[PDB]
């Protein structure tokens, strides 16, 4: 447990309030409207908080925009929206300039448990009757309760005379003691009331928490901070690709304008990443540092101990607590360290220790308690040591919160004791970060008891524990006679069917409406008005991509998970299940069977016993050497030129190759005939020219790959075909065939109904094309492995047009064929409206296709357009957040494989046909740059597209009237 | 289509009854596929007992309401 | 240091372009002290006003900053 | 990254895009990776199918959006899925090596049909559904065999 | 490239382990790293180099030639030289022979036209309005060859190899040393018939309108393992049946 | 301890905290082992702890108030454990 965690490179910043703000939104916005969201409830009015924290004119722009833009009259949902977004932009127009709030809005909840009549225990949140605002809970707090009580106006003059309130400050005495100070007490509940009505601002706030994963106390402070404003870095032990995206997601939701999240890796139980951590936040900007100066420190980093009795104690609780003790007083001296080296007298971080109130009450928790009342030591050290005007002590004695320990929290709540939700113990606590108590710690160290009267109950641990007997042997008496009653029931009288789901793939053709609901859309003057034989429509689409089919890479695309359907199809794709009809171990069996086992499959099961292996080997992911022929980029086969020093042994060769030999070498080898059999020795000599093969360590690991098991034999391609064309042929071809089955063309030839031959054209073409052949005839050819005598053709970027056209078209219509690039499918698509607009076809195949090899990726590696995929791994990406458009950090784009096509044609034809229709083809255009030195820089060309002049634009284009157009028509 | 070409072909009107129970199992079993198929989730089977088949046109008439897909 | 929490020898040194002075504990304060009682008093037209420097400066101020456009 | 963005922000500056009303950007390769001539097809797929959901997929790889890119303010970066109630038109644009720009565009297919009468909307409709019909069969049949 | 002498390579397994030779600390451990147990590599403590000792049962690829039967082939004239026609040194060596005569063939074809400065077909159309329509069968295989040959021997390739290998990469070339338009680029490939695919794209858009002017045309090179694979597929004719 | 204060914790006062806390507690535990595998429940060893009255009064002294203030721990362990009956705590808040 003391290794290391911590690295400066992986630190993930999050800074893009203004976008996700915009992105908050743009969500409620629509949630509304859809009526996930029908009435104003307490998560509709966090997400406004959330936006007014974010907001800022491009936001109220955005905002007036999407609400003037909404039209009320479409159902009431819209006008709802309506009316709330603009009390939105009222009430962001008015903080525009105030400082982002921390307000939590939530309902506060109280522990349930409840025994069913079978002796079933459930906990639950149910609201509490009482208390409904953190406004109302503050007054709560201030109240207490009968145990709590000992022998215009601020709720702090709520209090009753002679009590306890639930949370309060203490004061240590001159004897040494802390003791209830009405003062203190008063000061905070008072800033909680400003916190709960107002909202506490965070600006200016460097944090430094630990012990904020999902589930924690740490975590609900971590958003309140974030909602405030701080700059908060949150550290975690569980660095991943989940634990980024849920703080990314925190982030996003609570990020309020000038908050930056930085997630750390670390490890709290080695000083190594102790003193890296606070060394990489007190550094320069310049030094690989944030250069920030901690206004705060949260150390709620710990581990569970469980069962830990004293004659328990080891190396679990030493390592426990060395994370909750010694790594803490370590990191507290590290800031100390920097702030001194730095000269900082007048900026005290507030540590903000989390203090537990019982100290070895309960047992059984190795060494937590030591850990916690050792942590007191604290207050005094504050004024005996010389690290006063650094740090400034707070100790915050947390309550009992509800995250076995909240089934007996009811049972708790029975004599006034109050026990705490995360979120009204991450309330108490952000109300130790309000700038009064922040002076408060600064005057004198703190004491925040927030423990809920808990102490005043007298033997707490044998209570709870005789609380949980009681609720144990309620539940397991009520089990038992519940079962035994149904015995002798079942006993005496003598002895509902359920239907699973089955996966049924749909085609997904677009949704038809009716006449006049297509109609209310569109302009009465469209009626006509278009030569639909010039209007371009595509009328089919599939793809053979890193997630299977369209159907499939949509799903991931859009929802992120499979369902049903899509992991059938996954399945079925990657050839983990096939279908079996007929005898199968006897019995008659029809469905899903497992490919290698032929194991009946349910669909139910696809996804319990397919999904990990699915996800595992689809998207980007490690390149897989049996996807790319023993292609290894960790192991790239070379060969070195070598000039033989001395001669070689002879070996034996044939007549041919022995000739061959001599040819090359010249006078540098000796060739013999071996009258024994008739074949040659060969034997180089010193100086002859040699190829020794090495290996290359290549730093581009991961390839978006078309999902491992992928075989165009799923589809139904022959084996002779696989073995003449290429696989960038055989995607091209699935592609092909899965376009013109979403153009519901189960047959080719049915175009040709409508059509001449002529008439249907192929524009789909490749950047680079046939790679695999390529391979083969400049490596296989030079190495003289069997390469087929015509690679040359397959090699073509118009052979898989020409595979296509005579596999499945036999069509004579144009085929031309474009590269591009990266470019070359909106090439395609624009050569391909040209063609039906100029009427040499009706019906074009468009897109374009590509193939992952070791040779291309090795050349974008030498020209470092792909991403570095040890640069990744440093920086703690994993191959699925390896691309990340459009973000601060992405340093090269992922590589990917596979092919996509498009059937196109006239409007007029494919309402003729009766196909499908996705989507009007309405510009397709392509475009240079400019004069340059750099081949793959990028460039505004394309903005021609944007061109336009205005001169003179005092008045509107009758042209650009529609009815002007139709009366001319 | 399927469940009312097999009721007109194993259900008989003027008795009011299927002509075998195993024809009748059969049907009701193909309702069920049918609930399987169009089913979204796991869900209580419509026809939880063959014996509600007595009212084919009834039975056939909630399935494919409750599935109006498959119609 | 003293007074206003600044280094003219680490200004002159490192001519940073901005100079957070931070109020935190009693010398903060103090310092925080000395930017409220900076005034800039004007006779003008026989009446004494008195603008004060720093008017961002107050009993909650816990920072202030001196900007520059480079140094 | 940041030529596509300002080439987009560029674009609707000039065609006098309404302010505050950023066109939300689509980043399919976050997931599906760049393939060097597929990439357009992909997100022509892409953009057919949020034109028929109504759905924009969002950059779940988006930790964190460029600063630089706050400037383009025509432009939006979402990184979760937003259920809109309609997507009109989608602006597919690729910039390949060799200086190859292009950009489609792809309207809403139910904006094709407000330009013909409603009996040849009928007959159309009933043909696209036999189609489908029919396309499901084929499509069910051919892969389970 | 001598057809009478096309070089290769045969594997063969290591019979006898062969002579200690020196290689650097690198080239050493990319031998350990390719061979394995089949290969020791020893520090020299005298100069830190490598002595690399491959064993019995290594892996080992001898050069041998190839008698091959396509001698003739229609060739520029010998002395063509881009510097003749003014293409500077430093493009010679970043693009490929392919892209050395697509534009001395652009220049020249505008001089036909009389566009002596391409910049002219501005003050008559706009930048958007001049497309390149042009393309090649296979592009360029000089680079190809790179990627796929000598940079698999490790000989020293450009790092962007693969760039300049592209069939659009000529294209470019022209529209960056020549031409600075922003209209339509659409780069046919169509094997011998890619220059009537490039003029039929070239009207199409210049019909659509997306263009004015269109440079169409096409362009091809000869090599040695296009040749040997046309070879193969007996499209050529045989030198030594002639 | 001598002249280890809050940003002085290092190996040493690491060290002195392991003796005088963990490996007490240790000690204590491992007491209890012995008597409990020998079904000693009534023979108590009476651990007398060296208590401090002051936990970091006087400071520099590295981990030593922590130790001390941790060790106040086993009066509440001794209640809440299960060996009681083994080890019985003295706290001997030694003075001056
Ligand atoms: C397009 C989406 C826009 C939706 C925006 C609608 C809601 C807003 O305008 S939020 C503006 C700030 N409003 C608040 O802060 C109110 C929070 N304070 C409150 O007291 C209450 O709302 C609660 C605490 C939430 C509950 O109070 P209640 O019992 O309902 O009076």
Redesign the pocket.
């Known amino acids: 447990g003391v290794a290391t965690s911590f690295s400066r490179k992986k630190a993930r910043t999050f800074d893009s309030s203004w976008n996700w703000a915009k992105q908050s ?1 743009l969500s ?2 629509f949630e ?1 409207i859809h009526g996930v969201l029908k009435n ?1 409830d ?1 998560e ?6 959330n ?2 924290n974010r907001s800022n004119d491009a936001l109220i722009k955005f ?1 007036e925009y ?2 003037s833009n909404t039209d009320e009259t479409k159902g009431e949902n819209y006008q709802l ?1 309506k009316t ?2 603009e ?2 932009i ?2 962001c127009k008015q903080v525009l300039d105030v400082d982002p709030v921390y ?1 939590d ?3 506060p909840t109280g522990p349930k448990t409840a025994i069913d009549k079978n002796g079933n225990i459930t906990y639950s949140e149910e609201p509490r009757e009482k208390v ?4 109302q809970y503050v007054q709560e707090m201030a109240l207490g309760g009968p145990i709590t009580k000992e022998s215009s106006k601020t709720v702090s003059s709520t209090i009753p005379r002679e009590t306890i309130p639930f949370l309060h400050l203490r004061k240590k005495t001159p004897a040494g003691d802390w003791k209830y100070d009405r003062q203190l007490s008063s000061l905070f509940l008072d800033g909680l009331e400003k916190a ?2 107002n ?1 506490v601002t965070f600006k200016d706030k460097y944090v430094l928490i630990t012990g904020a994963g999902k589930g924690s106390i740490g975590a609900e402070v971590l958003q309140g901070l974030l909602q405030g404003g701080a700059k908060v870095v949150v550290t975690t032990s569980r660095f991943s690709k989940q634990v980024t995206d849920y703080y990314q997601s925190i982030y996003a939701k609570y990020g309020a304008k000038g908050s930056t999240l930085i997630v750390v890796p670390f490890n709290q139980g080695s000083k190594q990443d102790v003193e890296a951590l606070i060394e990489f936040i007190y550094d320069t900007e310049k030094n690989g540092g944030l250069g920030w100066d901690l206004d705060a420190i949260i150390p709620f980093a710990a581990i569970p101990e469980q069962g830990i009795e004293l004659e328990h104690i080891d190396s679990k609780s030493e390592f426990a607590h060395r994370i909750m003790l010694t790594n803490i007083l370590r990191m507290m001296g590290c800031v100390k360290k920097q702030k001194s080296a730095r000269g900082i007298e007048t900026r005290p971080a507030q540590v903000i220790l989390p203090m537990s109130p019982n100290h070895g009450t309960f047992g059984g928790d190795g060494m937590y308690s030591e850990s916690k009342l050792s942590l007191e030591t604290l207050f005094n050290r504050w004024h005996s040591e010389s690290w006063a005007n650094q740090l400034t002590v707070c100790g915050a004695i947390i309550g009992w919160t509800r995250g076995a320990n909240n089934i007996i929290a009811e049972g708790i709540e029975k004599m006034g004791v109050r026990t705490f939700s995360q979120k009204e113990m991450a309330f108490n606590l952000l109300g130790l970060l309000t700038p009064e108590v922040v002076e408060l710690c600064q005057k004198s160290p703190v004491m925040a008891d927030l423990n809920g009267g808990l102490q005043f109950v007298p033997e707490l641990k044998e209570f709870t524990a005789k609380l949980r007997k009681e609720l144990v042997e309620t539940s397991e008496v009520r089990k038992a006679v519940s079962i035994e009653t149904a015995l002798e029931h079942k006993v005496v009288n003598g002895n509902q069917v359920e239907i699973q789901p089955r996966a049924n793939i749909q085609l997904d053709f677009p949704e038809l409406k009716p006449y006049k609901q297509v109609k209310q859309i569109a302009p009465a003057e469209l009626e006509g008005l278009l030569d639909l034989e010039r209007v371009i429509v595509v009328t089919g689409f599939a793809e053979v991509g890193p997630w299977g089919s369209a159907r499939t890479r949509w799903e991931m695309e859009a929802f992120g998970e499979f369902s049903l359907e899509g992991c059938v199809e996954m399945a079925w794709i990657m050839g983990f299940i096939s279908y079996h009809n007929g005898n199968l171990k006897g019995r008659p069996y029809t469905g899903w069977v497992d490919s290698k086992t032929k194991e009946p499959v349910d669909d139910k099961d696809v996804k319990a016993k397919y999904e990990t292996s699915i996800l595992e080997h689809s998207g980007i992911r490690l390149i897989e050497p049996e996807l790319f022929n023993g292609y290894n980029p960790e192991k790239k086969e070379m060969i070195q030129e070598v000039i033989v020093e001395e001669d070689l042994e002879p070996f034996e060769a044939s007549k041919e190759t022995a000739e061959q030999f001599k040819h090359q070498h010249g006078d540098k080898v000796d060739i013999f005939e071996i009258p024994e059999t008739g074949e040659y020795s060969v034997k180089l000599l010193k100086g002859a020219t040699l190829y020794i093969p090495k290996a290359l360590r290549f730093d581009r690991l991961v390839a978006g790959q078309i999902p491992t098991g992928w075989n165009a034999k799923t589809y139904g391609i022959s084996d002779d075909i696989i073995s003449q064309v290429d696989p960038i042929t055989l995607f091209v071809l699935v592609s092909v065939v899965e376009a013109f089955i979403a153009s519901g063309i189960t047959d080719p030839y049915e175009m040709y109904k409508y059509v001449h031959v002529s008439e249907v054209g192929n524009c789909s073409g490749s950047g680079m094309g046939g790679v695999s052949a390529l391979r083969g005839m400049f490596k296989d050819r030079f190495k003289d492995e069997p390469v087929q005598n015509d690679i040359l053709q397959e090699s073509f970027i118009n052979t898989m047009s020409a595979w296509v056209n005579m596999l499945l078209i036999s069509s004579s219509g144009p085929i031309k064929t474009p590269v591009g690039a990266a470019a070359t499918s909106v090439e395609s698509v624009d050569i391909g409206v040209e063609t039906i607009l100029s009427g040499k076809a009706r019906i074009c195949i468009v897109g374009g296709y590509d193939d992952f090899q070791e040779e291309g990726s090795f050349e974008f590696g030498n020209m470092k357009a792909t991403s570095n995929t040890l640069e990744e791994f440093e920086h703690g990406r994993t191959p699925a957040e390896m691309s990340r458009p459009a973000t601060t950090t992405r340093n090269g784009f992922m590589e990917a494989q596979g092919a996509g096509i498009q059937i196109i044609m006239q409007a007029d034809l494919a309402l003729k046909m009766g196909v499908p229709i996705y989507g009007i083809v309405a510009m397709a255009a392509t475009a240079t740059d400019k004069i340059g030195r750099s081949v793959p820089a990028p460039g505004k060309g394309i903005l021609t597209t944007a061109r336009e002049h205005h001169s003179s634009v005092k008045y509107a284009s009758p042209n650009l009237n529609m009815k002007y157009r139709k009366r001319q028509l | 289509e399927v469940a009312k070409r097999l009721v007109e072909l194993m259900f008989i009107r003027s008795t009011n009854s299927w002509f075998d129970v195993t024809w009748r199992t059969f049907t009701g079993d193909f309702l069920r596929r049918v609930e399987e198929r169009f089913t979204k989730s796991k869900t209580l089977s419509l026809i939880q007992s063959y014996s509600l088949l007595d009212k084919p046109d009834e039975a056939i008439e909630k399935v494919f309401n409750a599935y109006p897909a498959a119609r | 240091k003293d007074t206003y929490g600044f280094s003219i020898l680490d200004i002159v040194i490192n001519n940073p372009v901005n100079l957070t002075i931070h109020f935190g504990g009693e010398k903060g304060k103090r310092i925080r002290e000395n930017y409220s009682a900076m005034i800039f008093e004007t006779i003008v037209d026989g009446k004494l006003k008195t603008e004060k420097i720093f008017k961002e400066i107050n009993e909650h101020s816990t920072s202030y900053t001196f900007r520059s456009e480079k140094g | 990254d940041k030529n596509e963005s300002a080439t987009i922000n560029e674009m609707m500056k000039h065609l006098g895009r309404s302010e505050g009303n950023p066109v939300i950007g689509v980043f399919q390769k976050f997931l599906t990776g760049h393939p060097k001539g597929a990439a357009g097809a992909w997100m022509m797929n892409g953009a057919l199918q949020i034109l028929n959901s109504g759905i924009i997929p969002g950059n779940r790889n988006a930790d964190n959006v460029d600063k630089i890119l706050e400037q383009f303010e025509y432009v939006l970066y979402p990184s979760k899925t937003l259920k809109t109630d309609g997507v009109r038109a989608v602006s597919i644009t690729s910039f390949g090596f060799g200086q190859k720009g292009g950009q489609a565009i792809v309207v809403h297919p139910d904006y094709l049909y407000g330009a013909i009468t409603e009996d040849r909307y009928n007959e159309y409709v009933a043909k696209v559904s036999a189609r489908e019909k029919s396309a499901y069969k084929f499509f069910h049949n051919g892969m389970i065999y």
């Open positions: 939104l409620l916005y509304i104003v307490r509709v009015v966090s997400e406004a908080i936006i007014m905002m999407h609400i929206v709330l977004g009390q939105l009222e009430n307000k809005v939530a309902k409904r605002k953190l406004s709960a009505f909202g």
